[PDB]
Design an enzyme around this catalytic site. Structure first.
Site, PDB file in Angstrom:
ATOM      1  N   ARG A 176      -1.654  37.398 110.582  1.00  0.00           N
ATOM      2  CA  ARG A 176      -2.261  36.323 109.811  1.00  0.00           C
ATOM      3  C   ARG A 176      -1.577  34.999 110.101  1.00  0.00           C
ATOM      4  NH1 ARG A 176       0.219  37.371 103.724  1.00  0.00           N
ATOM      5  NH2 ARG A 176       1.580  39.128 104.305  1.00  0.00           N
ATOM      6  N   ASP A 194       8.065  47.199 116.257  1.00  0.00           N
ATOM      7  CA  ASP A 194       7.438  45.995 115.732  1.00  0.00           C
ATOM      8  C   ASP A 194       7.825  44.790 116.591  1.00  0.00           C
ATOM      9  OD1 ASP A 194       7.074  43.561 114.302  1.00  0.00           O
ATOM     10  OD2 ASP A 194       7.763  44.391 112.401  1.00  0.00           O
ATOM     11  N   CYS A 219       2.273  46.316 116.611  1.00  0.00           N
ATOM     12  CA  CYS A 219       1.178  47.171 116.150  1.00  0.00           C
ATOM     13  C   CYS A 219      -0.157  46.428 116.161  1.00  0.00           C
ATOM     14  CB  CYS A 219       1.465  47.778 114.771  1.00  0.00           C
ATOM     15  SG  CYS A 219       1.410  46.617 113.393  1.00  0.00           S
ATOM     16  N   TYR A 220      -0.104  45.101 116.109  1.00  0.00           N
ATOM     17  CA  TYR A 220      -1.327  44.302 116.171  1.00  0.00           C
ATOM     18  C   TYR A 220      -1.895  44.266 117.588  1.00  0.00           C
ATOM     19  CZ  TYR A 220       0.131  42.991 111.492  1.00  0.00           C
ATOM     20  OH  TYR A 220       0.525  43.035 110.173  1.00  0.00           O
ATOM     21  N   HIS A 280      -6.820  38.817 107.679  1.00  0.00           N
ATOM     22  CA  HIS A 280      -5.769  39.606 108.313  1.00  0.00           C
ATOM     23  C   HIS A 280      -6.310  40.465 109.447  1.00  0.00           C
ATOM     24  CE1 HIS A 280      -2.283  42.161 108.903  1.00  0.00           C
ATOM     25  NE2 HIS A 280      -1.598  41.372 108.095  1.00  0.00           N
ATOM     26  N   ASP A 335       9.502  53.254 115.509  1.00  0.00           N
ATOM     27  CA  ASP A 335       8.911  54.296 114.678  1.00  0.00           C
ATOM     28  C   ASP A 335       7.637  54.784 115.350  1.00  0.00           C
ATOM     29  OD1 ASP A 335       8.153  51.505 112.899  1.00  0.00           O
ATOM     30  OD2 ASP A 335       6.492  52.843 113.408  1.00  0.00           O
ATOM     31  N   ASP A 351       3.801  41.100 116.019  1.00  0.00           N
ATOM     32  CA  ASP A 351       4.147  42.482 115.705  1.00  0.00           C
ATOM     33  C   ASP A 351       3.380  43.360 116.680  1.00  0.00           C
ATOM     34  OD1 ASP A 351       4.186  45.134 114.711  1.00  0.00           O
ATOM     35  OD2 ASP A 351       4.109  44.495 112.623  1.00  0.00           O
ATOM     36  N   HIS A 410       4.508  52.333 115.158  1.00  0.00           N
ATOM     37  CA  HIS A 410       4.548  51.235 116.118  1.00  0.00           C
ATOM     38  C   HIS A 410       4.474  51.721 117.559  1.00  0.00           C
ATOM     39  CE1 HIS A 410       5.886  48.718 112.650  1.00  0.00           C
ATOM     40  NE2 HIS A 410       5.110  47.852 113.278  1.00  0.00           N
ATOM     41  N   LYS A 422       2.437  33.741 110.193  1.00  0.00           N
ATOM     42  CA  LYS A 422       3.375  34.860 110.144  1.00  0.00           C
ATOM     43  C   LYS A 422       3.761  35.282 111.565  1.00  0.00           C
ATOM     44  CE  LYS A 422       4.344  37.067 106.719  1.00  0.00           C
ATOM     45  NZ  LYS A 422       4.580  38.312 105.933  1.00  0.00           N
TER      46      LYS A 422
HETATM   47  C1  LIG Z   1       3.399  54.816 105.080  1.00  0.00           C
HETATM   48  C2  LIG Z   1       4.720  54.323 104.590  1.00  0.00           C
HETATM   49  C3  LIG Z   1       5.589  55.240 103.929  1.00  0.00           C
HETATM   50  C4  LIG Z   1       6.832  54.818 103.457  1.00  0.00           C
HETATM   51  C5  LIG Z   1       7.230  53.495 103.630  1.00  0.00           C
HETATM   52  C6  LIG Z   1       6.367  52.574 104.287  1.00  0.00           C
HETATM   53  C7  LIG Z   1       5.115  52.989 104.762  1.00  0.00           C
HETATM   54  S1  LIG Z   1       4.079  51.789 105.584  1.00  0.00           S
HETATM   55  O1  LIG Z   1       4.761  50.522 105.557  1.00  0.00           O
HETATM   56  O2  LIG Z   1       2.820  51.650 104.899  1.00  0.00           O
HETATM   57  N1  LIG Z   1       3.862  52.279 107.176  1.00  0.00           N
HETATM   58  C8  LIG Z   1       2.477  51.966 107.737  1.00  0.00           C
HETATM   59  C9  LIG Z   1       2.164  50.538 108.265  1.00  0.00           C
HETATM   60  N2  LIG Z   1       2.139  49.431 107.306  1.00  0.00           N
HETATM   61  C10 LIG Z   1       3.158  48.364 107.373  1.00  0.00           C
HETATM   62  C11 LIG Z   1       3.097  47.484 108.617  1.00  0.00           C
HETATM   63  C12 LIG Z   1       3.824  47.648 109.795  1.00  0.00           C
HETATM   64  N3  LIG Z   1       3.463  46.665 110.625  1.00  0.00           N
HETATM   65  C13 LIG Z   1       2.544  45.922 110.017  1.00  0.00           C
HETATM   66  N4  LIG Z   1       2.319  46.420 108.788  1.00  0.00           N
HETATM   67  C14 LIG Z   1       1.386  45.877 107.807  1.00  0.00           C
HETATM   68  C15 LIG Z   1       1.069  49.378 106.255  1.00  0.00           C
HETATM   69  C16 LIG Z   1      -0.082  50.183 106.386  1.00  0.00           C
HETATM   70  C17 LIG Z   1      -1.079  50.143 105.411  1.00  0.00           C
HETATM   71  C18 LIG Z   1      -0.933  49.300 104.302  1.00  0.00           C
HETATM   72  C19 LIG Z   1      -1.995  49.266 103.263  1.00  0.00           C
HETATM   73  N5  LIG Z   1      -2.928  49.261 102.328  1.00  0.00           N
HETATM   74  C20 LIG Z   1       0.214  48.495 104.166  1.00  0.00           C
HETATM   75  C21 LIG Z   1       1.219  48.534 105.148  1.00  0.00           C
HETATM   76  C22 LIG Z   1       4.989  51.779 108.070  1.00  0.00           C
HETATM   77  C23 LIG Z   1       5.380  52.689 109.256  1.00  0.00           C
HETATM   78  C24 LIG Z   1       6.496  52.079 110.015  1.00  0.00           C
HETATM   79  C25 LIG Z   1       7.803  52.138 109.282  1.00  0.00           C
HETATM   80  N6  LIG Z   1       8.119  53.491 108.800  1.00  0.00           N
HETATM   81  C26 LIG Z   1       9.431  54.128 109.060  1.00  0.00           C
HETATM   82  O3  LIG Z   1      10.257  53.512 109.699  1.00  0.00           O
HETATM   83  O4  LIG Z   1       9.849  55.223 108.260  1.00  0.00           O
HETATM   84  C27 LIG Z   1      10.774  55.101 107.168  1.00  0.00           C
HETATM   85  C28 LIG Z   1      10.640  53.715 106.522  1.00  0.00           C
HETATM   86  C29 LIG Z   1      10.451  56.134 106.158  1.00  0.00           C
HETATM   87  C30 LIG Z   1      12.179  55.296 107.610  1.00  0.00           C
HETATM   88  C31 LIG Z   1       7.038  54.132 108.057  1.00  0.00           C
HETATM   89  C32 LIG Z   1       5.709  54.051 108.761  1.00  0.00           C
HETATM   90  C1  LIG Z   2      -7.238  52.173 109.608  1.00  0.00           C
HETATM   91  C2  LIG Z   2      -6.536  51.524 108.455  1.00  0.00           C
HETATM   92  C3  LIG Z   2      -5.527  52.400 107.765  1.00  0.00           C
HETATM   93  C4  LIG Z   2      -6.044  50.120 108.746  1.00  0.00           C
HETATM   94  C5  LIG Z   2      -4.953  49.607 108.048  1.00  0.00           C
HETATM   95  C6  LIG Z   2      -3.838  48.913 108.813  1.00  0.00           C
HETATM   96  C7  LIG Z   2      -2.708  48.302 108.001  1.00  0.00           C
HETATM   97  C8  LIG Z   2      -1.798  47.528 108.911  1.00  0.00           C
HETATM   98  C9  LIG Z   2      -3.249  47.452 106.870  1.00  0.00           C
HETATM   99  C10 LIG Z   2      -2.874  46.106 106.738  1.00  0.00           C
HETATM  100  C11 LIG Z   2      -1.894  45.702 105.660  1.00  0.00           C
HETATM  101  C12 LIG Z   2      -1.771  44.214 105.297  1.00  0.00           C
HETATM  102  C13 LIG Z   2      -1.742  44.012 103.801  1.00  0.00           C
HETATM  103  C14 LIG Z   2      -0.552  43.589 105.940  1.00  0.00           C
HETATM  104  C15 LIG Z   2       0.485  43.036 105.196  1.00  0.00           C
HETATM  105  O1  LIG Z   2       1.773  43.523 105.398  1.00  0.00           O
HETATM  106  P1  LIG Z   2       2.950  42.630 105.938  1.00  0.00           P
HETATM  107  O2  LIG Z   2       3.122  41.370 105.121  1.00  0.00           O
HETATM  108  O3  LIG Z   2       4.213  43.459 105.860  1.00  0.00           O
HETATM  109  O4  LIG Z   2       2.681  42.321 107.461  1.00  0.00           O
HETATM  110  P2  LIG Z   2       2.350  40.911 108.077  1.00  0.00           P
HETATM  111  O5  LIG Z   2       3.503  39.968 107.873  1.00  0.00           O
HETATM  112  O6  LIG Z   2       2.137  41.125 109.561  1.00  0.00           O
HETATM  113  O7  LIG Z   2       1.086  40.359 107.468  1.00  0.00           O
HETATM  114 ZN   LIG Z   3       3.719  46.496 112.659  1.00  0.00          ZN
END
Ligand SMILES: Cc1ccccc1S(=O)(=O)N(CCN(Cc1cncn1C)c1ccc(C#N)cc1)CC1CCN(C(=O)OC(C)(C)C)CC1
Ligand SMILES: CC(C)=CCC/C(C)=C/CC/C(C)=C/COP(=O)(O)OP(=O)(O)O
Ligand SMILES: [Zn+2]
Lengths: 339, 447
Positions: free
Chosen positions: B292, B353, B300-301, B244, B360, B298, B363, B295
């Site tokens: 990955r 995204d 943020c990548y 990933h 948000d 996005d 992103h 998929k």
């Molecule tokens: C922190 C949080 C708190 C409540 C709900 C979700 C999350 S989170 O999914 O982990 N977060 C961070 C990004 N993200 C989700 C993401 C977004 N784009 C790609 N990814 C993987 C992650 C990060 C780390 C890990 C681990 N270990 C897993 C997922 C997502 C951000 C974007 C969406 N968010 C946002 O819109 O706020 C709401 C949902 C509360 C209204 C919250 C912050």
């Molecule tokens: C510095 C540190 C905190 C780095 C962490 C960054 C963060 C994005 C971790 C990765 C999470 C991973 C499990 C993605 C899966 O979520 P998904 O299935 O929702 O997303 P996907 O479809 O793009 O894989």
């Molecule tokens: Zn994202």
């Protein structure tokens, strides 16, 4: 408040929230918490400060989880209580299943599950419906990273590499969506992942050797390799542009110490001739075959031709990588020519 | 029909399989939502459009969005409770990228993180939450950005060192908190905190990891990261998991904290498999990166995958003497820029995204970080601001100016869209990372 008026909680005084709205300047990104959440968390602060391991504290963690399952601290404290009180973990797992089904994207729940399931005293063997529950999750989100990660741990913990449901569940998921890369990755672990109990876990064999040989198996089961390559070809024929089985095949060949040229004719079948291309992965495969495992003249030119097709027509967004490969091949052929 | 937009970004891929699955249904829907935006013909898009047919970065809208994100949220946002330090970081980072002076946030940052720091060490999500490496990482980076002695003095360094020592695992990695998960995100966050605060390399004398033969924070760490590479070439969160982009960044950045990229990266990673997997993250016509295989793209990548590239390219190029040839960019800067600017901008402010998603601050932060990366040459040198992680503080930058005409490696942003450069490893401005490190280097470790 429900806690403040409950005689069950009279023996402990809550710790009020210190946001920072008193020490000086106003804090950032504040949340105007509901009264219920403020009260519950104030009591959680109190019980954690006293290191209290009790039934009331356990119920409190459950209440906070119902309000905010993304509270990492409460999950960890809950685990501490469960073990300290010798609670029935079978019942906790049944409760946890319901929470997981309500919050598909929550990963904290799945670390918690690992913590519980790791207890040999409570779970000496694989629970009879554990794999079924994982499939209930995958039926809703087939690529859930945290559920797949848990399943990897589960396989290693209970030694399930050759367990028929592991391969059956992978194949069911690949029948439903052959493009499910999470299923392909799990399949690699089942078939070629390191199993040595006296070694740290790894995605690949031979991590102690040169990085170019990472993945190489110490002992190769040739019949297994043949079977896995045949499986890969069959899935590819269903959808040739699907990257997952091509990457899987590269992994298998690397593990087995076999050259990419074993699939030379197979790759060629997707590029018949103007050229009718059914797979860009077949083109990239041929590029590597002619560039590396072929030391005859004309081979380098053929590899460059394949990479040119990629950069101009079949995968043009990766043009700079294709060009890098061309430069590598050109330099290599020039060095060979100097000899 | 802007003439400056190549067919590559106006059409679906040439090759299409007959077989339909959930994967292709989602991919098709995503492409169909992106196409009108890529073409610059969607009614939600605001100008001016440049010579490449790309809308301007809406700087004012994004500024207002980020400033608003630092204020109070309703009770319904309770799920963000444990992530409040991230909220501060994402906003400050975005404001910094857009050229704001964030030093006026010093006292408010101090007030926020004072209550979140635990007496036993580390920073958690807030008052009463246990210390976590992610919140500590977010807090330290926020402190670095606002700067100032008072913010720097807030951290209990010795307690942070003792707490971090408790997270060190026998297999070389780190858990994210006591009793929490062990993944590469944990290792990266821990080592960034360790480096920026100039903590002692040695584990605390009473650290549990010492029973397993480990002596320093870095003992067994690159070996652990090596065991996270997969058959695909990419890097997973923990050994055996799926490759990933987010974890690839964590692992690569962490390795570059251990030594020179051209030494450490090829030694512990198979670059021959890593390179094509990284390359394969980018799609057309979208232009952006997926995390990955199979998929979706996005924004943020743009950071997680995007910032792997300076690290990998440094591993191939080697360290630059201030007194040599480069492999250049091995991805499409044009594609990424088109995705961010054409597809990820919300008309009301903030970035997203993908089309169809609400914006948000997470992103917004990382799309902007990715946009900044394409605008600079990032490279490591033989001159470090550290008086002794030497390579990590040797990173320098030169602008990669906006381009004219067609080409495989061009800047299709305008100079009006130029953002502040960020450090490839620390994800804050170079000067911010330099200042905090140097300050702590000159402070005696407390008794
Ligand atoms: C922190 C949080 C708190 C409540 C709900 C979700 C999350 S989170 O999914 O982990 N977060 C961070 C990004 N993200 C989700 C993401 C977004 N784009 C790609 N990814 C993987 C992650 C990060 C780390 C890990 C681990 N270990 C897993 C997922 C997502 C951000 C974007 C969406 N968010 C946002 O819109 O706020 C709401 C949902 C509360 C209204 C919250 C912050
Ligand atoms: C510095 C540190 C905190 C780095 C962490 C960054 C963060 C994005 C971790 C990765 C999470 C991973 C499990 C993605 C899966 O979520 P998904 O299935 O929702 O997303 P996907 O479809 O793009 O894989
Ligand atoms: Zn994202």
């Amino acid at each position: 408040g429900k806690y403040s008026s409950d005689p069950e909680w009279a023996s402990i005084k809550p710790i009020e929230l210190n946001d920072g709205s008193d020490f000086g300047a106003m804090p950032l990104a504040t949340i105007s918490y509901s009264p219920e959440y403020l009260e519950a968390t104030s009591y959680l602060r109190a019980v954690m400060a006293a290191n209290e391991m009790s039934e009331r504290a356990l119920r409190l963690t459950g209440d906070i989880i119902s309000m905010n399952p993304a509270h990492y601290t409460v999950w960890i404290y809950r685990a501490k209580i469960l073990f300290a009180l010798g609670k029935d973990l079978n019942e906790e797992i049944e409760w946890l299943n319901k929470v997981a089904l309500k919050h598909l994207k929550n990963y904290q729940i799945w670390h918690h599950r690992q913590v519980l399931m790791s207890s040999r005293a409570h779970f000496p063997t694989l629970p009879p419906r554990e794999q079924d529950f994982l499939m209930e999750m995958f039926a809703q989100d087939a690529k859930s990273y945290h559920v797949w990660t848990y399943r990897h741990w589960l396989v290693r913990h209970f030694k399930l590499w050759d367990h028929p449901r592991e391969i059956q569940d992978v194949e069911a998921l690949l029948k439903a969506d052959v493009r499910n890369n999470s299923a392909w990755n799990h399949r690699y672990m089942l078939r070629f992942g390191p199993r040595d109990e006296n070694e740290f876990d790894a995605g690949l064999h031979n991590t102690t050797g040169p990085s170019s040989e990472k993945g190489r198996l110490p002992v190769v089961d040739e019949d297994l390799v043949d079977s896995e390559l045949q499986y890969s070809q069959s899935r590819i024929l269903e959808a040739p542009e699907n990257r997952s089985p091509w990457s899987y095949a590269r992994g298998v060949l690397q593990a087995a110490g076999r050259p990419l040229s074993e699939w030379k004719d197979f790759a060629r079948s997707f590029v018949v001739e103007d050229v009718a291309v059914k797979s860009s992965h077949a083109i990239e495969w041929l590029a590597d075959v002619y560039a590396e495992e072929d030391g005859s003249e004309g081979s380098a030119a053929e590899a460059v031709k394949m990479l040119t097709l990629l950069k101009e027509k079949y995968d043009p967004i990766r043009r700079n990588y294709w060009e890098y490969r061309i430069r590598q091949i050109t330099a290599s052929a020039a060095h060979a020519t100097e000899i | 029909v802007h003439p400056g937009i190549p067919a590559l970004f106006r059409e679906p891929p040439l090759i299409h399989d007959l077989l339909s699955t959930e994967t292709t249904e989602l991919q098709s829907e995503t492409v169909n939502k992106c196409l009108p935006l890529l073409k610059g013909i969607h009614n939600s898009q605001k100008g001016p459009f440049n010579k490449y047919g790309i809308p301007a970065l809406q700087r004012k809208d994004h500024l207002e969005y980020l400033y608003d994100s630092l204020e109070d949220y309703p009770a319904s946002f309770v799920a963000l409770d444990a992530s409040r330090p991230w909220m501060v970081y994402w906003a400050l980072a975005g404001l910094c990228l857009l050229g704001e002076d964030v030093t006026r946030f010093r006292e408010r940052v101090i007030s926020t993180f004072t209550a979140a720091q635990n007496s036993t060490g580390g920073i958690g999500g807030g008052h009463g939450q246990m210390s976590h490496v992610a919140s500590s990482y977010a807090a330290v980076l926020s402190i670095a950005m606002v700067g100032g002695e008072e913010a720097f003095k807030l951290i209990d360094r010795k307690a942070m060192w003792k707490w971090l020592g408790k997270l060190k695992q026998p297999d070389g990695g780190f858990t994210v908190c006591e009793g929490g998960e062990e993944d590469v995100r944990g290792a990266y966050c821990a080592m960034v905190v360790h480096a920026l605060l100039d903590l002692p390399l040695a584990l605390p004398p009473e650290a549990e990891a010492r029973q397993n033969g480990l002596e320093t924070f870095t003992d067994g760490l690159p070996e652990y990261l090596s065991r996270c590479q997969t058959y695909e070439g990419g890097i997973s969160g923990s050994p055996g998991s799926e490759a990933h982009g987010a974890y690839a960044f964590c692992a690569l950045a962490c390795l570059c904290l251990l030594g020179r990229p051209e030494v450490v990266v090829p030694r512990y990673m198979n670059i021959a498999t890593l390179l094509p997997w990284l390359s394969a993250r980018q799609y057309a016509p979208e232009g952006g990166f997926s995390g990955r295989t199979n998929k979706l793209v996005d924004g943020c990548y743009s950071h997680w995958v995007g910032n792997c590239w300076p690290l990998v390219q440094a591993a191939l190029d080697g360290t630059q003497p201030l007194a040599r040839s480069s492999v250049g960019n091995l991805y499409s800067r044009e594609g990424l820029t088109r995705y961010i600017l054409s597809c990820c901008q919300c008309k009301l402010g903030g970035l997203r995204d993908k089309p169809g998603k609400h914006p948000d601050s997470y992103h917004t932060c990382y799309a902007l970080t990715g946009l900044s990366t394409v605008q600079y040459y990032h490279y490591c040198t033989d001159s470090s601001v550290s008086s002794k992680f030497s390579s990590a503080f040797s990173w320098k930058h030169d602008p990669n100016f906006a381009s004219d005409g067609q080409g495989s490696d061009i800047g299709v942003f305008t100079e009006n869209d130029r953002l502040v450069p960020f450090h490839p490893i620390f994800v804050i401005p170079h000067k911010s990372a330099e200042d905090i490190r140097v300050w702590f280097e000159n402070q005696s470790f407390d008794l």
